[PDB]
Design a protein around this nucleic acid. Structure first.
Lengths: 134, 158, 259
RNA sequence: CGACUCUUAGCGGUGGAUCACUCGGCUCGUGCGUCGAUGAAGAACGCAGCUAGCUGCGAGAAUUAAUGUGAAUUGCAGGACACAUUGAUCAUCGACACUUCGAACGCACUUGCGGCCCCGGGUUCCUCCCGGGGCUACGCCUGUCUGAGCGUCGCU
RNA sequence: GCCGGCAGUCGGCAGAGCGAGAAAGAGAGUGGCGCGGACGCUACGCCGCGACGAGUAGGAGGGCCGCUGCGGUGAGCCUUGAAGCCUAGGGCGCGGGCCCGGGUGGAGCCGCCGCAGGUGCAGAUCUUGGUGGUAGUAGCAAAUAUUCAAACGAGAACUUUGAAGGCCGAAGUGGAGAAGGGUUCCAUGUGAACAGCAGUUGAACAUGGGUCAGUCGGUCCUGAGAGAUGGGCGAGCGCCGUUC
RNA sequence: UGCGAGUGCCUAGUGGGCCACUUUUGGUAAGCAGAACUGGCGCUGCGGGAUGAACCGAACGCCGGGUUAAGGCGCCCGAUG
RNA sequence: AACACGGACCAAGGAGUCUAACACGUGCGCGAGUCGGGGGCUCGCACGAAAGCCGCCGUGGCGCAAUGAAGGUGAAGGCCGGCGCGCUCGCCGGCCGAGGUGGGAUCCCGAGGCAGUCCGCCGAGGGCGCACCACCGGCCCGUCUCGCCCGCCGCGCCGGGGA
RNA sequence: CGCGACCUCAGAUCAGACGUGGCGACCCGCUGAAUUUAAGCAUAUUAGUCAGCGGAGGAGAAGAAACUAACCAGGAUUCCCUCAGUAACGGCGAGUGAACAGGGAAGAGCCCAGCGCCGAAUCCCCGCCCCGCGGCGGGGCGCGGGACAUGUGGCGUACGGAAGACCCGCUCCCCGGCGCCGCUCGUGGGGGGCCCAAGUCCUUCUGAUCGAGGCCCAGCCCGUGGACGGUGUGAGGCCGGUAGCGGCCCCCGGCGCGCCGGGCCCGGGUCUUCCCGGAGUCGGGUUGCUUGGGAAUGCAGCCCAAAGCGGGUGGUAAACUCCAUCUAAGGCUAAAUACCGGCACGAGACCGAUAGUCAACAAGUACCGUAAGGGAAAGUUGAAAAGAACUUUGAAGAGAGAGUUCAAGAGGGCGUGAAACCGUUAAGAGGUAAACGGGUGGGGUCCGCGCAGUCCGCCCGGAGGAUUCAACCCGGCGGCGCGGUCCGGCCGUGUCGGCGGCCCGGCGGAUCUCCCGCUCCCGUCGGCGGGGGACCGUCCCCCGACCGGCGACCGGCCGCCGCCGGGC
């Protein structure tokens, strides 16, 4: 359990912080684990979802082996949208049924110069615990 | 309405005592607050005793007790003039000094002088400069003592 | 409960002569709560009967000899394996109930060998029993930071802190007790004396230095010796079967005499 | 057999009790313990593309600047950004700004009347008029200036 | 209630009893083939006799009666269905109540040992909320009065138009203001809710629009009065007073 | 003649009573007021007196058989039909 | 049952609680002792605002001593032998050492019997007598009365002692 | 008749600053009741409490004795326990009710007026230069002004102090700037930002698994991380975090070292000579309030009103006399202490939407009263709106279909949906209102998945089958053993002996007596304390005996018996 006396560990307080978190905290909570092949190449367990990543669906009714790109991230409802994960409405229109980022595995990230600096710093901190804990 | 042999009790609850109820749930937190400040006090004065300056040998008034020996407010000036320490130097060296204490007896005076005389023997006065001035202490006396004295200095044995 | 609860309103009862029945009611206004009723335990809202105060006697003090009395009976009930199984602990594979191990256990720093130590002592089944007993708490305690409950496991009594607390930390059910700081609330949880215990070599030799025998003092507490037994031969099956008692008994009357 | 009335059962109505949930209260404990004439607390009035209430903000009005973070806000459109650029959104916030009343401060609260300087239109100060800016409250300390006294005195 | 009985299940390490009118032992000594025997005893338990059984205020004891939460405990139950609710089903206990069967329901819940309480309702002209009889009942009666045809509409006793007959009768049911109301004023559209019937209508709702001053008022002046400065009083917020 | 006796602590509730055989005060009398002993209702159901505070019998765990008290045996209504 | 009052019905809420002072009874620990209040010491407090420990372990509260308004005082005598008046009084050495009477649960001895020994058991009668009750005595403090004796650093408006 | 100083008093939109108001849980200074009790009530009590007023702070107040005590004397103030429900007060009724001492938490002392001595040696403001200036300071220059002799600064305050002569060995501290190294205990002082382990493995139930089984040592991996929250249920390994003396990057602070510019050359002891006390104040009388304070505890109004070997106090008023203890009428001072307000948190044997704050929600909101003020009700669709496209009746509200969802038997006040009440269907009954108890009878819906009716052991008869029964052999396990008294270990709330461990053992003692330290007296003699040393009680080693036990506590053979496996 937790030993820092400044940690919430409360039923009401953790849910209040989770649901009323601001937008930049909501980016961190909405983090998705990488694929198996990228895990030995980046040494990174998880990474927040982005705008133009493509996603293999893990669980749910849309669970399968299809790989589909994220359309847009809806951070208010804590959920993201996939191109091939949708559902036709009554009137024939199609509505993207969202999948929570916790049920999301990323096959390849959409890399930019602000993203390479995050892959290495999470991998650098990975190697500190291996050397110190050896 | 008393009935069948109780004591005539006089409870002092006729005032509005419920507005002034002092709860003691602060007791364990106050003990930590006093203790954590006591350790912090002892760490600011690294070689000095945690209890503070030396207390004199003091007998009780009020003939009820008449035999117990307490820890006093401070050493009187008549006791300090015998031992040869000036009253403005004893405060800085770690001796409790008060001007109010009279000295009517004689055996109690030598008890406080002998307490002060052998206190100067075991005292380790650090020099102000790292290069030690006159009447300080040798460097051989320093390195084998890097600890304080827990409890009162020279506890008083009845 | 706050003393201002049920008293922030300003209500006094309407006098006699109206169809209402003498309840302190809200004074006027075009409001739902207007002439309704307050300042009573029977009304909606209002004060509760005998409001709970902060100065209730929450703490109870017990005599030190009595507190030291139960811990002597708690440690003595860690033996006699009929007591330990009656608590529910799986002891069938333990080679010896007073488990004494070396002082090398103090020097452990990882939980991997702490798990391996319990398996080689065949005491892992209690933790295995604890794992299957992890479930949601019944009642309203889940929404009051008491979501999960589980069986307590084997307590380990350590003498020196050298990483033994660091090892037996994540494995559920194990509580670490210092020898000089033993606790009756963990040596006998729930008011039941049975508790399976793990001792080290330094911990086990300090028990006769903490309390002593009947012919020696505590030698670490100031004034304590073990309490006197009210009776020595506790097994009365041998006292009643002793030939010197059967000699003095009369002939029994076991023939049943009905109406 | 009917119509009406009573009991029970099923189903369908009024009603929201019980139960399980809870971004909420109560109590205790810890740290700090900070308002204001450089204009406090409070109040009024306004501010979003579509905005009534809550909250936030003050004519720079759903926020400006900077730092951190880094692809969104989103109910619907829109458009910035290339996230190869101090850069969308959030938090921090240390720079700037902060309408009116309000201790409220030119005089009183009708948002009406004033005066003293400076500037721009009037004009090329020559007085009106208009617009903008800085001042103009009480109590009191040190100092400065101008004074008063058949107060005490000298010079005359 | 019984000086109640039961540790005696003392078994090829054995001999299975002490209901029997009478104070005490189925007591030790020394000279003259076939391996066999039902239940039990949570000794806070089991078993045997005798007597008794009402009850207000009141007292005591037992609850394996019940609710909520806590420490243990059931290798406890549970999306192959928890709590809650219903039941002409099966039952148990004298009883408090409890266990199953069926249906709804979808996510937590129960037994035992102890602990703690905001712990059990039929009333208090109890509180809150909901629903009945009354009851489709009383009622929709103060100020003389409406009728005919057409238009809109799905729909007209109540809207509009035309005609007729009336009333208010210039101290009015008229034409304008002050106080007060604050968009109620005007156009379009709707008829969900209000106008105690209805409504195509309205002061209802949704969209928009609408108040223009040197000369009309406020602004200026003072009356009755209010109210600072000086002054005085007051522990004090401050109070007295308008030329002292 | 019958019954096992003595003794010490706390302790609720009560402190408005009523009726009846007998004795009896005031009052003409009272289902009036006020006293003594005993028994009842209060606190108590049951059979009977048609009905019922106190009248007679009789006092009560749940039942079967038998027998009675007081009352009764034309019908209501068990029993002299 | 009332021509006494409240009650149309239903669901939820709804009333002997807590603190302190006590008295008694009961359970536990220690015991002429008991207690840790408060404080301090261990590990950072998850559980732990818990636990353990103290020439603080007794400062202190209660109890072990009471009686007086107070100055104050304060809980045992008896036997034996000697010294002066047998003077039931003063002074010297040993003994019993906390009284006696009656009732007293239990236990001991126990005549006898269940040629002759041991283990039990019962037993008329006799006892030391638990607890407790009653009584007579004895002792301490306050007070009343009758009297004498003893002692000194200060001989007295001294102090103590008796019935 | 004017000018020039001085004193008093004005005017300033003079130059530069200062106070107002709010919060107010805690505190300080006033003012200040009645409900209530005393079974009435008037003193008393409530209570110096509620209300009212002013004032600040993060704490405030108080605070270094005109003290307590009568002791072998303690020694600022603040808080806890205890004294203590005590002394004392009280129609001595109800009730009210301290303080000393002791044990603790904390512990820090000082500065003026006066007396004096120094050439006003002092301080404020304006101008110029250097430094840094976002808590306007340091140094220098100015016949540049002002304050001040109606008293500034230095020494100096009751503990004595000051000035001279003389003895002792002497010279470090403070202020304003600048830079540098140690991250500077809760493990690195604080604040901020970003990160750090391990299954979504196989199969299976489900609408969705976080469910169930398994995974080479009970299972796969981490665990200095199995708390929590979210994720379509019940998650150590899906995610954030969690743990850590974990990592990285900024900002701020104090303690140390060095440099520059300044200030400061400030001791103690002996002898001699000097000085030293705060007025309308203490105190007394009276009055009123308060207090336990009682012939007046304390505070106030009036009157009287001082002295210096004096004055105050010493719980009974007054007079006399010995004493004991302080020095009032001036001031500063952190710490132990309180905190229902605010900021940021943590926790709960607490309540779970008529409960919990009035307010879980657009709550001090809607609304009410002219105003002071009063003041609600109101949580939940669904995993995801996937919020019912489209056909038809009706003008429409409303329906029938269709469609989504595991579910609308979840359809916008939608998690379940009780009772009162009402509608409809099935059955039954109905003129002594309805309803109830005992006893039956009849009719229903379901249950006994009843409808040729329960088995359990021994023996007898004939029909069938095993690789089988008794008795022997080997191996293993177990029980018992008065083996009358096998051998060997262990323990004892039993002893003896060696009194041995004594030193190759510690503890405690109100049992006694070479070394060290201190003062008194002339290297010595007497005193005090401590450390050895001896003694006593209690825990340990050796041999043997005796006793008990291994039946809360055993090892090997041996003898008997039982069980299992394998050979027959």
């Amino acid at each position: 359990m937790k030993f820092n006396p400044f940690v919430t560990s409360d039923r009401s307080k953790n849910r209040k912080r989770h649901f009323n978190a601001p937008s930049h905290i909501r980016r961190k909570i909405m983090s998705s684990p990488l694929s198996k092949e990228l895990r030995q190449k980046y040494n990174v367990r998880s990474m927040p979802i982005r705008k133009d990543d493509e996603v293999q669906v893990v669980r749910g009714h849309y669970k399968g082996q299809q790989i589909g790109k994220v359309v847009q991230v809806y951070r208010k409802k804590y959920v993201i949208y996939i191109e091939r994960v949708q559902r036709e409405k009554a009137n024939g229109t199609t509505v993207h049924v969202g999948i929570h980022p916790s049920k999301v595995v990323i096959t390849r990230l959409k890399l930019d110069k602000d993203r390479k600096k995050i892959l290495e710093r999470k991998a650098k901190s990975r190697q500190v615990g291996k050397e110190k804990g050896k | 309405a008393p009935s069948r042999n109780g004591m005539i009790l006089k409870p002092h609850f006729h005032k509005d005592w419920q507005r002034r109820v002092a709860t003691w749930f602060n007791q364990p937190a106050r003990k930590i607050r006093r203790r954590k400040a006591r350790q912090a006090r002892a760490r600011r004065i690294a070689p000095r005793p945690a209890s503070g300056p030396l207390r004199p040998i003091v007998r009780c008034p009020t003939v009820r007790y008449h035999t117990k020996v307490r820890a006093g407010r401070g050493f009187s000036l008549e006791e300090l003039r015998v031992a040869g320490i000036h009253k403005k130097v004893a405060r800085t060296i770690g001796i409790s000094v008060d001007p109010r204490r009279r000295n009517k007896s004689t055996e109690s005076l030598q008890a406080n002088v002998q307490r002060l005389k052998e206190y100067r023997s075991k005292l380790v006065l650090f020099p102000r400069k790292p290069s030690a001035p006159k009447k300080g202490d040798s460097s051989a006396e320093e390195l084998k003592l890097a600890t304080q004295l827990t409890g009162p200095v020279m506890p008083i044995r009845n | 409960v706050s003393e201002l609860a049920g008293h922030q309103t300003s209500a006094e009862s309407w006098g006699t002569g109206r169809a209402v029945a003498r309840i302190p009611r809200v004074r006027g206004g075009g409001t739902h709560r207007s002439g309704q009723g307050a300042f009573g335990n029977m009304c909606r809202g209002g004060r509760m009967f005998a409001p709970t105060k902060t100065w209730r006697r929450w703490h109870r003090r017990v005599n030190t000899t009595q507190k030291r009395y139960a811990i002597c009976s708690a440690l003595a009930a860690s033996a006699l394996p009929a007591l330990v199984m009656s608590k529910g602990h799986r002891i069938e594979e333990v080679p010896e109930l007073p488990l004494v191990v070396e002082d090398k256990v103090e020097g452990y720093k990882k939980t991997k060998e702490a798990v391996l130590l319990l398996k080689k002592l065949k005491a892992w089944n209690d933790i295995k029993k604890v794992y299957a007993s992890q479930r949601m708490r019944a009642g309203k305690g889940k929404m009051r930071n008491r979501r999960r409950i589980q069986r307590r496991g084997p307590c380990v009594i350590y003498n020196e802190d050298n990483g033994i607390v660091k090892a037996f930390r994540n494995i559920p059910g194990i509580t670490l007790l210092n020898v000089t700081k033993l606790n009756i609330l963990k040596l006998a949880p729930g008011g039941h004396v049975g508790r399976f215990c793990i001792w080290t070599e330094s911990a086990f030799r300090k028990l006769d230095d903490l309390y002593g025998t009947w012919r020696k003092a505590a030698s670490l507490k100031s004034n304590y010796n073990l309490p006197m037994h009210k009776m020595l031969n506790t097994d009365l099956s041998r006292i009643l079967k002793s030939p010197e008692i059967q000699r003095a008994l009369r002939a029994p009357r076991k023939k049943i005499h009905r109406r």
